[model samples]
Target: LDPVIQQVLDQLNRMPAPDYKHLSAQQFRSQQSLFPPVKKEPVAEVREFDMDLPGRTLKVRMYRPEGVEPPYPALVYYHGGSWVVGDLETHDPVCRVLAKDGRAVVFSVDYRLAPEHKFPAAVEDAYDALQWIAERAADFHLDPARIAVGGDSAGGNLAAVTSILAKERGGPALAFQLLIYPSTGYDPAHPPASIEENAEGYLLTGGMMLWFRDQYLNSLEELTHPWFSPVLYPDLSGLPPAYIATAQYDPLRDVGKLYAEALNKAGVKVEIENFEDLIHGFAQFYSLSPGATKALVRIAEKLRDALA
Candidate 1:
């Protein structure tokens, strides 16, 4: 492991360990503010607005880099908090980096969280936001033809599924997809080896994963639904090209590899970057973790080149 990351872990170890095992979902969310990731430098322009969808309104934040012209290539980003706790604010720094480094106008989506919204609700909001951004691309000074979708963790799962939905629905074409340690399978019976291999002490735990799923999915029956688990999708063809990332120490690691394999088998173009020494949510440490910051910059360059 990198010495920088080891220092971070050491610091984390010194802090009082909260037993998320007993905390209610709301209580767990409340704790996020206490250890918030350090924010990176801001982008050139930032704007906030409420977007009206069919059944809900999403809070959206737009970011543009310095000196960029109008009609920018855009990325619709979903924040990661296991599909429950993240919001526009928690992920603001991430979006800023994506905008500045990737050279794309970033639309940070505040999708509806679960335990209240449930499965398919977040999916619907994601797809809807993609369509909305593409339709009003001109209004945002973006190129409808150059739009991409991406996210981290749970948000990455949504990005992958949204690509599939776009291909199936036949509109709002996506130029690319960026997935960072996405949860691609939810069935406990067919658990990936990484879940057991890196189950604890690497930031995200198996128990926490279960709790997250319990809040997002309405029932076990929805586990294999293509929208919920992209790895289970029968046909991954026709989706946009992808940049998939995985952290070696993350429980979700092998599942991300599995999804990349599936996409390759389906003849979809993909680039997988495995951060061998990093843990889950490493990208969230972009400002403080050197490895993560480097990885984010490399990924951003890839995104910028792909969108170019």
Candidate 2:
């Protein structure tokens, strides 16, 4: 690990870790402040609005790049919280960076969390958000044909599955998929070897993963479903091209790699990179870690080119 990353982990360990098993979902969510804080950035403009879905109104934040004109490409982003925590506020800085650096408009989704909206609620909201954005692209000054979907951790899972869903359901074609250290599988008890070895002291532990699964899923059967565990999907053909980045020490690393390989084998265009000195949730540390900031910029560059 990089010395800086090691120092960050040491500081994280110094804090009292929450017992996900014992804490209520709300309690566990409150612990998010224990991590490094987000640094706000300036953008051309930001607007908050609500998208009315079937039984509720989903909140969304739109970030427009500085000096950019209308008819811009769009990237619909989802925030990571292990499917239970995190909101548009938690990932505001990231959306700002992507919108500015990628030279595109960004729409950050505040999807419903689990333990209250279990199983496929987040997934449904994500896909719906994509459809809604495409349907109203001109109103948002966006080009419907240039839309992409992306996120980190649980959000990454949603982004990945949304591509598949888009392909299957048809229409609103996606131009790219950005998955940063995504959770690709749901079987906590029998995860890949990387989870067994990198299970502890790496920010995201295996126990917390199992607890997250318990909160997000209503039944064990959902574990194998492709929507919940995208890696379990039998086919990957026809999905949008992907940029999948994984942190070396993250328990989810191997699955991210496996999913990338699966995508390649199934004839989908994909690129996978490993940040050898990083750990899980590094993308959220952009304000504190130079490497993290660089990684985000790199992703934004890739996104800019891909959408072009």
Candidate 3:
């Protein structure tokens, strides 16, 4: 409801969706290079950390917020690319802003993507990364009691389920889970209404999601895995507090909302925020849209409080 955000959405509504067809995975990944590299002058010193996770050397971009000292709260961030594309570089701006805005150190995880790392591979990497961060909390300037997990889209799915599994396994103790327009279900019809209403001109179409499915998953049956479709989880209780955001003109909007509702029903703390006029992947357009910036800031605020 911020006026600046509203104006940005109004302008974005008139723009056409980018053509993603005919672009191979290689092309899509290569396009990242086209954006040109940006030098982030951190408010404080931002360090880069690398650790091996599940057959890969996962790169983590650790941003230390201005004025925050050692043992500061930390956020483990994941990027969204339908589980096929995206890296720490792709989500650089948001992580930088969140680290500064929330006054917390943020460790943006470059998790392994799929088609190459299918099924629970992405989830496993995410889980391992979270535990790795937790076990080495002192080294990362993080408090074990205030550790949190969050991400966008497919990353959000991992964050949600990873928090669930962590609690069920009893150890890592994530204080919060932040899911932004999370792809929460495997059922094509779960957000059937939104798919029809916001199906086109929003960057993310149902058809495109189908394409993502083909690329990220090994088989349709993998859809049933809780790591893939977190909304389908049987028990949603005893997990960390959840702050889920959804864009109204998004195919996955309802799923995020529904997941929040399920969490509330199971007696978990839940807050659902909806940007009714925005589109899926809007956060990626941070420089162009105030709506996206504000959304990112709001999510960071929630994480800040949860960690506090």
Estimate the lDDT of model 3: 0.78
RMSD, candidate 1, Å: 8.2
lDDT per residue for candidate 3 within 1-308, as digits (tens), equals 89755654554443344366765685344323234432232447556778876568888888788887767887888889999999887787677767777778888898888788777778888888898889899887677877888889988888997888897888698988888899878565445567678777889987888888888888878776777877778888888888998998887887887788888988999999998568888777664566666777777787777777
TM-score ranking, best first? 1, 2, 3
Residue pairs clashing, model 3:
none
Better of 2 and 3 by TM-score: 2
Residue 91, candidate 1: Cα error in Å is 0.5
Per-residue CA lDDT of candidate 1, range 1-308, in tens? 98766755543443355686886786445334235645444467778899998878999999888867867999999999998898998887678778988999999999989888888899999999999989998899898788999999999999999999999999798999989888877456878789899999999997898899899998877878889888988999888999988999999899899899899999999999898778998878875777887787788888998899
Q: State the C-alpha lDDT per candidate.
A: 0.85, 0.85, 0.78
* Position 45, candidate 3: lDDT: 57
What TM-score does model 3 achieve against the real structure? 0.85
Candidate 2 lands at a TM-score of 0.87
For model 1, the stretches where C-alpha displacement exceeds 4 angstroms are: 1-37, 186-189
Tens digits of per-residue lDDT for model 2, 218-261: 89888898999988788888889999999989999998988898
Clashing pairs in 1: 71-141
